[PDB]
Ligand code: HEM
């Protein structure tokens with residue numbers, strides 16, 4: 001069958017469709033119009049966007065397809081290097097780093113990160129306890145303070161001290177401006193127009209800021225000998241069981257930059273969306289708050305208690321269904337192959353998985369796909385294979401999944417234990433797009449229940 005394609009712009013093909021502040025949402029709209037698969041061309045580029053479980057289940061067969069670096073990831077690679085997120089599966093450092101780091105990101109490993117995750121969570125709760133009666137919370141702003149600080153502390157025992165600032169730490173200034181440049185480059189017609197020379201100079205300066213802080217951190221740890229409960233420790237001492245080799249200091253730097261990227265707004269977005277859905281769905285808020293009160297019986301939550309928050313976990317999954325904060329990933333065909341019995345592909349041909357659209361497949365979820373219903377996830381094994389992919393696919397799935405969900409469950413549980421929430425402005429969802437998604441301008445008021453820490 002002949003593949004549908006959206007509107008074109010003469011010799012720029014489909015490229016100006018991405019010249020928008022909200023490209024994911026635009027692509028979602030195209031999928032609604034065109035269906036489960038459409039072709040997208042640009043000068044020198046062809047991809048196919050997939051939206052249905054039927055076709056994505058095939059895309060997710062690792063014998064047939066492998067992770068591709070999207071143009072976005074190729075631009076992120078200029079500062080994330082051959083870290084896990086921006087390496088090809090066949091590069092030696094991918095499987096080396098993968099083997100070394102997998103045990104440090106397991107569910108068992110979360111027991112050892114718990115104490116420092118509580119450190120930052122308590123900082124958030126204390127900030128909100130200390131607000132005056134008149135005052136509101138800037139939700140994505142505070143969630144990002146929390147998630148960045150947690151990965152800094154758990155990852156390399158570095159305190160960004162985001163709750164002590166209005167101005168982001170200079171590393172985060174540089175990282176955010178670099179991520180912005182990478183996303184802004186995708187859209188651009190004539191990349192080497194003199195107009196973008198300033199952009200390029202700033203890009204190089206921000207890479208240097210990031211490299212300088214992180215390489216100093218790594219060198220300070222090597223020159224101290226100190227052993228922490230952190231990823232930097234394990235990367236400095238660990239050996240890949242397969243090659244017998246450690247990571248070198250340049251790759252360790254790339255992994256740290258990678259983890260700081262993920263721990264920024266990709267993780268903070270999940271919390272911001274979950275609180276959005278909770279204040280728009282009071283009966284769901286009631287259930288989640290009741291669970292928190294019943295389960296979190298101590299001033300300091302334990303690891304075991306966070307595992308006990310089943311309903312809180314269901315809320316977070318349902319927020320990942322509607323607004324997966326890392327909303328796409330890319331694949332390539334390893335050999336010539338036919339997709340869904342209808343769409344012949346050549347070796348090297350690219351696919352893109354539009355995760356928010358996969359998660360609105362009515363043939364899987366039913367017609368009420370836009371509703372916020374945590375009960376969809378009461379039993380994980382009711383969900384068909386390959387229907388729910390907020391953390392990607394296969395050996396190239398998110399290594400930080402257990403970390404992100406432990407942190408999110410802890411924090412959301414403590415927020416629900418300690419405060420009542422009010423959508424005082426009747427907030428209208430407005431999703432800003434960077435590398436990730438977030439509900440821009442989302443504000444609430446938090447009335448303390450006056451329960452001691
Ligand atoms: C809700 C929060 C998060 C979501 C939705 C998420 C989502 C994803 C997705 C969809 C991928 C696959 C990317 C692709 O195929 O191109 C991925 C990969 C990855 N994520 Fe996450 N992520 C989250 C949090 C984190 C955190 C907190 C970390 C680290 C501390 C992390 C580290 C990684 C790494 C290293 C990879 C590459 C894994 C590999 O290819 O070996 N992520 N993430």
Ligand SMILES: O=C(O)[C@H](Cc1ccccc1)NC(=O)[C@@H]1CCCCN1C(=O)CCC1CCCCC1
Nearest residue numbers: 023024042045070071072073186326327328329435
């Ligand atoms: O990067 C790409 O080739 C294509 C866009 C593109 C560019 C040029 C030509 C064709 C398609 N990217 C995408 O389609 C998607 C959706 C729109 C935003 C960019 N994007 C992405 O995947 C962003 C990459 C990752 C970064 C962290 C995880 C979540 C997103």
